[PDB]
Design a binder for this molecule. Sequence first.
Ligand code: HEM
Ligand code: HEM
Lengths: 727, 727
Amino acid sequence: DSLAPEDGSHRPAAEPTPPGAQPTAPGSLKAPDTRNEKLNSLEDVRKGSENYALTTNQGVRIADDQNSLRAGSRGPTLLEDFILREKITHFDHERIPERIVHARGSAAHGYFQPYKSLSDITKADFLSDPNKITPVFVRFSTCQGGAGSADTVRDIRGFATKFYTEEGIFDLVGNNTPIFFIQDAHKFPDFVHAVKPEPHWAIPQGQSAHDTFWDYVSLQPETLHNVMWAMSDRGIPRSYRTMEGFGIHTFRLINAEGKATFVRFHWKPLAGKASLVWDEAQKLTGRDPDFHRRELWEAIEAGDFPEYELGFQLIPEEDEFKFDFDLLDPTKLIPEELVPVQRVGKMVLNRNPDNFFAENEQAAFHPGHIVPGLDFTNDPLLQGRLFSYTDTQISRLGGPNFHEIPINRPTCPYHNFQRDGMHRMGIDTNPANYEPNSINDNWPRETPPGPKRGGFESYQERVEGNKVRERSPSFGEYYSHPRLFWLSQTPFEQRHIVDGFSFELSKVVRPYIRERVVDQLAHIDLTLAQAVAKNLGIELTDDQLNITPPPDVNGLKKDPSLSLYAIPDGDVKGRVVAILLNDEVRSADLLAILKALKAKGVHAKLLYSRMGEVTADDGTVLPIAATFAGAPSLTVDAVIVPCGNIADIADNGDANYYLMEAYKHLKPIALAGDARKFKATIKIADQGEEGIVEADSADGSFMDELLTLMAAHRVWSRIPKIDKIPA
Amino acid sequence: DSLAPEDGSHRPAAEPTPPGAQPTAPGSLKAPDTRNEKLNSLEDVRKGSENYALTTNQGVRIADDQNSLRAGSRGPTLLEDFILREKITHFDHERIPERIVHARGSAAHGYFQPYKSLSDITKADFLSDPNKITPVFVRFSTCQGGAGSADTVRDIRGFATKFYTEEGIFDLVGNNTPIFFIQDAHKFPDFVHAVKPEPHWAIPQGQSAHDTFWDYVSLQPETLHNVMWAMSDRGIPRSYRTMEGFGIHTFRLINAEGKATFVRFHWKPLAGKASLVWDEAQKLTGRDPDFHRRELWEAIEAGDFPEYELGFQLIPEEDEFKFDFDLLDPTKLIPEELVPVQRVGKMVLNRNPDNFFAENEQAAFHPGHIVPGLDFTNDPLLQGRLFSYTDTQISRLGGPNFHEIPINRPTCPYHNFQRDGMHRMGIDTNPANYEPNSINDNWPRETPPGPKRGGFESYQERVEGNKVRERSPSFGEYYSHPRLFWLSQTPFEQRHIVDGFSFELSKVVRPYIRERVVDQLAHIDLTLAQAVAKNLGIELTDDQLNITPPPDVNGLKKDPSLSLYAIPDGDVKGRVVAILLNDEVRSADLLAILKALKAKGVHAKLLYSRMGEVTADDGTVLPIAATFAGAPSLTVDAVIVPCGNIADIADNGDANYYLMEAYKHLKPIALAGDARKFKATIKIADQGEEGIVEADSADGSFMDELLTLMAAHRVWSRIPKIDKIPA
Ligand code: HEM
Ligand code: HEM
């Protein structure tokens, strides 16, 4: 045949295009000129296709790939069909075990560069010079669900970064909240068992809203801090581009003089912090369970590269015990009001992978993979993680040679006396496979530690204690950080936390677990406890009403850096606006709308009651991106309704529903000319309302008003009004 | 210790209870007295818990399961902590590869029994006596998505049954539609690759609504038949209890005299056929991705055992060539108007598993597992399946001894000379591991074929032809079955098919693919092609308008057994009704409502604006099951609103939205007394309308009317009215 069309419409343009303009494709075909040392080094295993003959894996050309070999055209298939058997066998063996946690994830390639040399505090080569660029590979993920679960669940998110440094791979394997649920790695199977689907029936997926999770939390108050972050809007990010990242544990930075400095790692999203609202997130898991995966991929194809600032909280070794919390306790955060985040460098994700399985699914990150200039601490959760990644990757990725899988390979040299193992790629020519050896003059050889290019030596921390299985008494405080978090949130963020706990505990079948969680909230803050209790039909006791609130954290009664929205940081580039078309669109409005959006890097999606095209007043042919039902308001940041023949869409139920949903979800809406007739559906004032942009036409200040609302993300003042709308 | 409450509310009652009344639990604890030979034979591997000490896997009691061993309570974790290392190691290795296809599935144990001896047509032991009971294990599944994807997607469903017979395991591995998409097994990797998530970015999950699927369909017209079924409401079943099951392929039955009879296998749902509507199914993927799994599990815990009647379509050997279609072509169905389904037996699923992973995830089904009395045919899709299941299970389940994993083990004797392999459990004492042998007097020994308890011998079919990779010319007809299916559907079923095609093609980014699909629909039926074209903004050509319709199927212009709903078969037992409460419910209404529902085996869920309890007018304390938002109308089959203080929920946006959503999804709604004020929300006439039950109180005829509507499943007459509602 064949039938790719004559117009060449099958193939997407190899240039940045806005979401939905062209079919997506493998990164190296979408952006062939985007390169980095790692992307180039993968060239040996990239496999093309065009102009090549179809063959078996042994290189034999196939003549007929449509039929098995049989004795007669209606006869039995013959065992000698080696073509069919290789093809079916490889298909039969396609799947590998998904990760134990973080199985649902989306990744991209990029690069990192420090703003200045950090040689006074660390000898890490990748932070030693502002013009030294280090390729990275980043994988973002949910945490509980399987690899086929949905993106916009309520859950913690993983944020893992593989740095291909000149002195080794450093993996920074963090999450989107600055603490973890538990204190010691020994409890990790217990916690993860409690949050994952229950064992009898394997329900629920991607949800902590079930009895065993809340049983565990209620019995293990150390979890309450991260639970508070998960119940807030932090648990439902708008995009991986708009959430923070944290390494959680205190690590060490080691300089050339041997000085150790404690450090906690942060990633700041340069697109700003932004989250969905629960009803929107939950409905989006049904409308588009691949929303975050798609959003990341389309941002990079559009040139809206995710950018993050690496930042360090630095504490001198002499200040280890100066806080009212233990620095080694992963359930405690270090307030930025106490220890500021120093900016360190920028990370840009600018290329999607070519093959998700080969590059994303087989990537292996490990917090153990550190480099000279970095070291660990005794945090008891970090200590046990050091054992687990290595162990799980051998079974997940089939053997001990997972570092030879292309995405995992260092770009710098690697030489040692390790040999064999399943799927061994490297063919070693060294005469010796042991050291010391004389037969190869002891090569490859050990290298002493030094200021640069030196071997790894651990910091010589003094260890003094008996061999004990004991929690440090300093870790036995569970309510002051949850309280600090609570008081740092805005009133509307506090309401959403309450709503999250209420919704989750309403799904817990055993009422006494609900009551025990409420009792724990009474140890954090009474207003919080009472608001959740009222939603659960629970009444606090007199004793509960008199629980003394936990102490402030080093005199802090709040830290605004813990809130998503108290300090504006809203950027609109990369956001999307739905434009609800009609069959006689006033092109003056459309011109003005698209020009204003284009100027700020905001994308548009043209919607209608059907697919195809509609023609504007002026004759302009407009292509329809999707239908009102086909691409609901859940997927956009704002909605504009231009003037024209509004009767065409005024009696359309889907069109009205579109605005009711967007209104409920606090998204800015802009109506021009006769589009103002839609105000009745969303029942608000004859004279108007903050959050609803309206004018006779879409001109000068109309688009400016709409853009200012989008920079603020959502219209929080509309909260009290949304409860009367049936949406 | 003592974390369980002293009223014993942590533990669910060991007796049938309605959905939501008690926490769910492992089958053997929930129904200890429900037994069968297979369930009894698994007792040797069932492990309890209560009153035992916590140990390592080697039997060593653990003292402190809260902490790792470290040097000092704030020191480093020590390598010698063997307890931590075993616990983390086992956790790190929990996952196994998911099934290549049908990775999402839900299973239960039950039993089968034939109505009468079928010895005249088959010597299969399990079909030989009405008193012979055969334990079964059934796994239902979706087909495209991973194990963590959602249940109510649009997709084919798998229906696999493992019969533990006295002469061997027979697995009947079928789907919920009577044909498959492709003709020859060589194309299975191509088709599956096309429907699964696209390889560069691994989107979309659980959906065929993407370009590669429709590209393949457009290029391979053999797919159109199953595609028609998938786009119909067949692709979105209400529950696994309410869908049909088919083996698809023509197999053979072989009696004791050696006569072969062609057979196609059917499962009829005794609960009747019933599906969701697309908007409901897609929203239910977000609100409860585990809806079918949960529904199956809770039906069994309630005593609403899923029941299916096994039926055979039987064709004499000499009638092989008497149809317009080839009996070996799996893209063609055998119309029940031509060859009736003979009732054969009943299957009842009456016990859930104890551990989903151990029993469901490791279950292994193979269509090649047949028993004497059955045989295969040359259907080329079935022939290639024979090779694939064995192959894939060794990698999925770790080795060649997967038949020793408890759920997969036969209940009958198994003895042979096979030895070793990974994870070997059986310790063979036979002196010989080969035959022929004299050292063990040749045991175990082969057995001749015979009427009962004999060895397997294949039916001696004549084979005549050259070795060729060639499709039979008899399979080259692709549009008459699609058209037969189309014409057999009700008008509302036809609209739902049109809507499915239009929705899915609107998600295809390359417009030419949409056009190619429409052209293939114009070879099936012009009305169908025009309606889908209109929704895509596509205009058929004059040549497309003149394509002659394909021929009838052996004189048939329709067959009502292909419709879900043209012949009523509606059962209400097991269905559920939402009851929207208010703070002063009129208990006369509630007593009448609940007793009427209870008499027909219909469940109820009492909803309110919060959790806890509400008090009825006469002091009756009413326990709240869930909130309006917490348990949406998506999860119920009907909604009743009793009288009382309606002002309490009349202003509630969620309560109104609950009715608008239920109304739009065609569910019966019943309003009593003051609850009739809600009619304005759903814009129903003053006089009333069919599908809305209304009266002054919930008495005599009110509940009979509502139950009548529930037996008809949905209110199809309301279809024209739902478009004006913004829901
Ligand atoms: C501060 C606490 C933790 C953080 C921030 C964290 C973060 C993550 C992330 C982001 C991933 C996915 C990396 C990817 O995208 O492939 C991951 C995977 C994993 N984590 Fe951790 N995790 C933490 C605690 C733990 C603990 C305590 C253990 C066990 C002792 C653990 C065991 C695992 C395992 C087994 C995997 C799968 C790795 C693989 O298959 O390649 N995690 N974790
Ligand atoms: C009439 C056509 C087909 C039907 C009705 C069918 C049905 C099913 C069902 C219901 C399952 C899941 C069983 C379970 O619940 O574990 C399954 C699995 C599977 N199917 Fe088939 N299938 C068909 C065609 C094919 C073909 C043509 C092939 C390959 C040549 C194939 C390969 C597989 C594989 C590899 C699995 C996974 C088995 C395992 O891991 O245990 N299927 N199929």
